[PDB]
Amino acid sequence: SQMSDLPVKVIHVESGKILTGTDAPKAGQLEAWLEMNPGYEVAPRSDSE
Structure with a gap:
């Protein structure tokens, strides 16, 4: 995926x-969700080194 x-x-x-x-x-x-719901921001992943 x-x-x-x-x-x-x-x-x-x-x-x-x-x-x-x-x-x-x-x-x-x-993009549409963030545009409709202002104040949110992309959160960090769980990869790390």
């Missing part, structure tokens, strides 16, 4: 809540 198919987490500044890939929007509809 591609990242575009996998969900991307986000962090809200107005509420401070962090949405996980489970509740967060998909990579394809993320």
Whole structure:
């Protein structure tokens, strides 16, 4: 699968809540979700070194 198919987490500044890939929007509809829900930001992954 591609990242575009996998969900991307986000962090809200107005509420401070962090949405996980489970509740967060998909990579394809993320742009629309963020545009509609202002204050959110792409959260970091769980890769690390």
